[PDB]
Design a protein around this ligand. Structure first.
Ligand SMILES: COc1ccc2sc(N)nc2c1
Ligand SMILES: COc1ccc2sc(N)nc2c1
Ligand SMILES: COc1ccc2sc(N)nc2c1
Ligand SMILES: COc1ccc2sc(N)nc2c1
Lengths: 198, 198
């Protein structure tokens, strides 16, 4: 038994499991299946410890998984480790993924920026909303700070750049990742088995 | 998209990943690759949260993985949760797996029983060695308790039913699991890719 060739086969299989788990995670996110998302996220994270070198494609895959993980924890130890909120961490990942900065990318970025403040207001932590505002900002900045200062959670600006609109735009992006990974090895072989039964 | 057929494909893939990870775990255990074992163990454990119903074969696979996990932690929160040591938990799993109780099964069982006491003596916790002895026992019982009472860690009985002899016998069992799972779908498809390159 050649230990080097066995290690190479384990790395090939980790690559297949990563794409499979990213697909599962995209679907659980799109479907709103929170417990399934949490289980798939735990598996995806553990699996990538079997890879010490990633291709550009695999890097994009792990960063999409980390991005969805932070969005899913948006309203929820992480505070003490990163010193920022989950939506601010989603913003950092989003602004660094190797992807085109098209109209959809900008729309999602702006929705996350405003929702990073609004989720703190929704939770009743207005001091934290101001600290998130200072870290992000740090067209209308003095007006946004006034809305936070005035606890005006349901101001028309917040109603337009809403949590639902952020989730709808992220889900449309998730649909593209889902279609682009639809033909990956593991899910395709698994659907072939299910189709034969049936 | 039929959500039921997608869930069925995810369950088929979890089954393939479980066999693949059990093979990887058997190899890391046999090779003494501790960090690789810990990584594969974390992945195997996370993956099986994607299965709510297991066949008899899958149950045997998860119990072999849990058994190796406890053996690997033999000398190392678990104390407060199970109220026993890792080797005593390995013994409980070993005595309940759906497998033949042949000569090798008995040899491993007896080696774990004595090593559950001896690892406590090796760590200098002689009070714990006596508590392990009382829980397991609880041909010569008064003699074994005297050896523990006398801190006679290197008594010929302990030298014969040694940690090395326990690991050699468990590794011979691991070789059978490894050969029996050698042709499972994921590792075989992965070795085929590596062979094509080479
Ligand atoms: C590949 O999936 C994931 C999902 C969540 C996380 S958090 C982290 N640091 N790495 C990952 C990877
Ligand atoms: C940046 O564009 C917008 C969109 C919606 C609203 S509601 C409001 N008060 N200001 C704006 C600005
Ligand atoms: C399938 O692999 C494993 C490995 C370790 C553990 S601990 C636990 N409760 N379940 C498992 C499963
Ligand atoms: C159960 O068989 C054995 C094997 C080795 C030894 S060394 C000793 N003192 N007693 C025994 C008993």
């Amino acid at each position: 038994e050649d230990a080097g060739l066995v290690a190479e086969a384990e790395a090939v299989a980790a690559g297949w499991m990563l794409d499979f788990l990213c697909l599962s995670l995209c679907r659980a996110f799109r479907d709103g299946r929170s417990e399934d998302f949490r289980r798939t996220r735990n598996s995806a994270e553990a699996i990538i410890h079997g890879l010490s070198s990633l291709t550009a494609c695999q890097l994009r895959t792990i960063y999409i998984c980390q991005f969805l993980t932070r969005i899913a924890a948006g309203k929820t130890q992480f505070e003490n480790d990163e010193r920022i909120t989950p939506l601010e961490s989603a913003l950092m990942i989003w602004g660094s993924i190797e992807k085109e900065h098209d109209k959809l990318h900008e729309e999602i970025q702006n929705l996350i920026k405003i929702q990073a403040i609004a989720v703190c207001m929704e939770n009743g932590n207005f001091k934290e909303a101001e600290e998130v505002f200072e870290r992000i900002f740090g067209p209308f900045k003095s007006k946004l700070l006034m809305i936070i200062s005035q606890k005006d959670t349901f101001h028309s600006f917040f109603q337009h750049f809403s949590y639902n609109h952020m989730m709808e735009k992220i889900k449309s992006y998730v649909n593209y990742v889902l279609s682009e990974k639809s033909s990956t090895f593991l899910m395709k072989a698994a659907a072939k088995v299910v189709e034969s039964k049936r």
